[PDB]
Design a protein around this ligand. Structure first.
Ligand SMILES: [Cl-]
Ligand SMILES: [Cl-]
Ligand SMILES: [Cl-]
Ligand SMILES: [Cl-]
Ligand SMILES: [Cl-]
Ligand SMILES: [Cl-]
Lengths: 687, 515
């Protein structure tokens, strides 16, 4: 390099444009620490012309504005980090403009069927000056905007302010090998006043797919050139591979973008793996992810769900890393540190509420909690969270820990979307396609148990299957509540969920006044509120309601019947001492009733008086209308039947035995709760 | 109450290490910077500079420097910690640790752990300063991110800890000598199960030993089973037992002002405890013990051998899930060939999948094997159903071990009575015969229980018509194996059956009177 003081034509001040002199000089130029010159660089000018630790004053070619180019940062790196800036902006609540330089995939094809590129001039470059925003236009549903959606949903847990915004300067058909990304860095960010007319706080290089005929060495040099320009202008640089669906491109991307990321010391991201997961869920997803509107196959430019899955990966590899929990069957999201995972926005005020931890007691389940988290709102709220499912086939259950002053009928509901992103516009030219894809995304939806049973309770709702990858969970509380409590979520698997008690034969002691569960665990394993709801074991608890009610079937078999004044307990809750009794009364009739912390006062008695030691079955159903648990009892000899018992009180619990008789007796039984999704009927007539 | 932004940690580096002769009055070999929570009002730049200052002092004095984030329970602190402590760790090139994730796991196990982890003695809520179990879970994370990384195995259901490289995972301390013994690999044979092993690991001690290990469970809902591969010269009644603690740490002091609270929390930590099968059945055997549920995160496993043994063999551990463990044979209908002299399993796998000793104990399938005993005995229920009964001189086999040719027979004898007995490498000589002589093709059930006193497997057989019952059969010989069929008759016959073994924890009774 040559010292700047020895180079022909250079004037060392801040007013003289040294551009012509600097690039007429054929070698490199050294500017020492503390020294600034004006060099009005043009977008094609290689900034690696300058070495040392000095600074350049660079005029904006489109606005009356100057920019500082830090040569020291360009030469040594600026040590900034994409994650660092994003987490810092969350903490400091400062604005964080995220710029992306990319090709077709990042442009937005095919994030929505009416996708279009940013405006470009006759040279093929980004228009400047400009007020264009891609996120509000043809690139509204690029993976970048789905990435933003995840960031903003995480941001929503602190504030309503929109601190994360994109500057997506991606155009289909453009290449890094051409120098297009290097040139349009300037034109895209400096030349666009909606993008701040400046270098963005974060700069993402997302190009790669187009250039596979160029040398590895050529492409590495272009990445080096790009990164140092962005470094010099103050950007926290990241490099991202967006797609893994091409055999040769994967290897190319590794040898260039992954290679240079490590060598330069800049964060590297790959969205490919999650695209592969989402798109390979079953035999039909290949259509949803890779088939274009004209019926052709394209794994290079994924459809709407593909663009979302990519954005979801980018979210997980950024804020999602600390602000989204990774779950497998068996995990629970509890009431602790909800502020990390939940927001709470009131409607219509639009207030973002902050969680409080309050002591609770005065009811058995509350004494288990000791503390719950809530918001005081006096208005309807929307509580949202996200989780990352590590496996396919996972499920989720809802716990509403205290329904306070809720009234039966209020429209409390919950919904799960996966993959996650900015919902497709339910309007315009592709309203039907968009509605279809959004519906497909929405994997769970329905009323919560609170809506069925009302206030003063603790209630559990089975929901159903999730998806591998990012899942969005929206929870609505209606009826303008004073207090709104955060729910807990239990995760299971559709291959094992339910209640499964195989055939068991055991005796019970006489003169009981309280039913007892057939199969207990340690209290440390299950204290009877939420932990074992539909976990699919001999220890499991039923749920109060399902998102999809009237589709499941409880089944009890008592093959050798029961002695007089001896009963089986269904949905028995040992904490509240509440459950359903079915068996043979002292008179020898069949009977079914509600054990409501005392012997039933609502006995339903049927059959003759000879039911002792005669087998029967019991079938349990639920109403999607009332949430009531309805029971049908049928003796094996066909003589004694009833369906005249229904409860909205003993709606969940464990299988138990009850022997209030004066002698020790044997009980033989099995029980199974099978989860369904499509509603089923179970009525017949006496004919 | 001390802060890094104040310069307190920088100053007290000297005072704490140089100024304390119990701490060696010198720079420590390892130096960990664990501050962070207090300083959130200070600039990111300010805090970074303080970390830089601290690390270089420690570097200069010879310390191997690490930086650790201990808690993740505050939204803003997580982001702050990332931008300072994580940031500087990477930039300076020093190891970074986060104990937060494991705290989150342990504390979020169910609806009650929030109390155990974050509720103070005065009944207030504090997620910043965790209770006893929280402090242990954090320490456990730090262990996993250090020595635990190579010296503690990460397990999921299906995994087994075998006899190979036990020295990596086990210790063996003798009592009362206090000797730490070194494992030896010896060839074993002369019994079917030993011929499967070929080699076992052991210690020669001539005294009582305590063998401990740790494993890291990747999932909640996991379980563990014990294999005692050779009970050598053990005698029935010796106090061999096993115990699991999770989370792991220095046990709270069972004394002083908080003896009750401390006893409570230690009991809660202790998730499994009880006698091993060896204690029930004695020497010269290979025995399996179902134990039960573990915890996500670090699990401590202590195994005691009593009675001053010459040889002490390392056990193997099989990991499963409480959602699937058991034996589950759905209704099957199949014919068997005549003139057999050996029972045969109803459902076989390849020998590579299961060679019949430990691999499929209570794995919860149609292929699974029962266990000899449970840590919690007298709480589980075996159940056999033979809805269409059996032909004469035809039997179902329970707990049949094809390796040793030992199991229980139940069915209809040549005379047409019900019968149950022990097939001890030959037809039974201990037949229990009951009911009339018309039992052919009449259905029956069989219920199997275990004694927490003797370990014996007791059987109750009941015909469907109610006429033929017995509970007069009990065994301490045919204690585990597979479901099998036995047709010593002269004709090919059909067998229809189902079987299920359900695991329980709280003891259950199963007696009634003839009245
Ligand atoms: Cl460099
Ligand atoms: Cl033009
Ligand atoms: Cl392209
Ligand atoms: Cl190319
Ligand atoms: Cl403090
Ligand atoms: Cl502070």
């Amino acid at each position: 390099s040559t010292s700047v003081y020895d180079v022909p034509g250079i004037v060392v001040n801040t007013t003289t444009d040294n551009r012509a002199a600097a690039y007429a000089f054929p070698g490199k130029i050294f500017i020492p620490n503390g020294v600034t010159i004006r060099c009005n660089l043009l977008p094609d000018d290689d900034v690696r012309k300058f070495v040392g630790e000095g600074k350049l004053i660079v005029k904006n070619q489109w606005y009356a504005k100057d920019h500082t180019f830090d040569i020291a940062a360009s030469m040594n790196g600026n040590n900034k980090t994409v994650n660092d800036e994003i987490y810092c902006a969350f903490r400091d609540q400062t604005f964080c403009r995220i710029g992306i330089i990319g090709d077709s995939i990042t442009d937005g094809a095919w994030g929505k069927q009416d996708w279009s590129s940013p405006p470009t001039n006759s040279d093929g470059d980004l228009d400047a000056p400009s007020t264009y925003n891609h996120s509000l236009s043809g690139g509204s549903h690029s993976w970048t905007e789905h990435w933003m959606n995840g960031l903003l949903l995480t941001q929503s847990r602190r504030s309503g302010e929109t601190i994360y915004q994109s500057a997506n300067c991606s155009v289909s058909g453009k290449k890094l090998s051409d120098g297009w990304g290097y040139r349009n860095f300037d034109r895209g960010f400096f030349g666009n006043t909606r993008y701040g007319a400046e270098a963005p706080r974060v700069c993402i290089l997302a190009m790669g797919w187009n250039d596979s005929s160029a040398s590895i060495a050529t492409y590495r040099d272009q990445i080096d050139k790009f990164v140092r320009k962005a470094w010099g202008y103050g950007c926290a640089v990241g490099i991202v591979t967006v797609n893994d669906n091409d055999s040769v491109r994967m290897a190319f991307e590794l040898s260039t973008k992954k290679y240079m990321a490590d060598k330069l010391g800049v964060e590297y991201f790959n969205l490919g793996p999650n695209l592969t997961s989402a798109s390979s869920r079953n035999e039909q997803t290949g259509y949803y992810y890779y088939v274009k509107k004209d019926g052709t196959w394209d794994t290079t430019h994924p459809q709407e769900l593909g663009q979302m899955a990519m954005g979801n990966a980018m979210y997980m590899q950024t804020l999602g890393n600390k602000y989204c929990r990774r779950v497998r069957p068996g995990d629970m999201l509890t009431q602790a540190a909800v502020e990390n995972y939940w927001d709470c926005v009131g409607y219509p005020s639009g207030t973002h509420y902050a969680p409080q931890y309050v002591p609770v007691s005065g009811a058995p389940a509350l004494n288990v909690f000791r503390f719950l988290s809530k918001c005081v709102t006096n208005e309807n709220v929307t509580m949202t969270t996200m989780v990352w499912c590590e496996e396919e086939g996972m499920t989720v259950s809802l716990l509403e820990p205290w329904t306070n002053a809720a009234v039966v009928g209020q429209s409390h509901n919950i919904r799960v979307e996966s993959p996650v992103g900015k919902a497709l516009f339910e309007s315009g030219e592709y309203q039907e396609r968009n509605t279809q894809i959004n519906a497909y995304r929405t994997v769970l939806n329905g009323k919560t148990a609170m809506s069925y049973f009302g206030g003063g309770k603790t209630l559990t709702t089975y929901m159903g299957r999730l998806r591998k990858g990012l899942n969005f969970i929206r929870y609505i509380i209606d009826g303008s509540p004073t207090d709104a409590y955060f729910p807990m979520l239990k995760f299971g698997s559709y291959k094992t969920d339910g209640v499964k008690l195989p055939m068991v034969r055991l005796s019970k002691e006489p003169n009981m006044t309280r039913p007892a569960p057939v199969m207990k665990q340690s209290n440390a394993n299950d204290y009877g509120v939420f932990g074992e709801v539909l976990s699919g074991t001999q220890f499991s608890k039923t749920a109060d309601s399902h998102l999809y009610n009237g589709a499941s079937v409880g089944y009890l078999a008592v093959p050798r019947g029961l002695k007089k004044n001896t009963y089986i307990a269904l949905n028995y809750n040992p904490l509240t001492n509440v459950g359903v009794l079915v068996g043979v009364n002292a008179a020898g009739n069949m009977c079914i009733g509600t054990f409501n912390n005392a012997n039933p006062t609502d006995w339903v008695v049927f059959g003759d008086t000879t039911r002792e030691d005669k087998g029967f079955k019991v079938w349990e159903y639920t109403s999607s209308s009332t949430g009531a648990h309805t029971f049908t009892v049928e003796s094996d000899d066909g003589t004694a039947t009833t369906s005249a018992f229904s409860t909205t009180v003993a709606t969940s619990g464990y299988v138990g035995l009850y022997n209030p008789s004066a002698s020790s007796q044997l009980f033989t039984l099995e029980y199974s709760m099978t989860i369904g999704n499509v509603g089923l009927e179970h009525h017949h007539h006496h004919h």
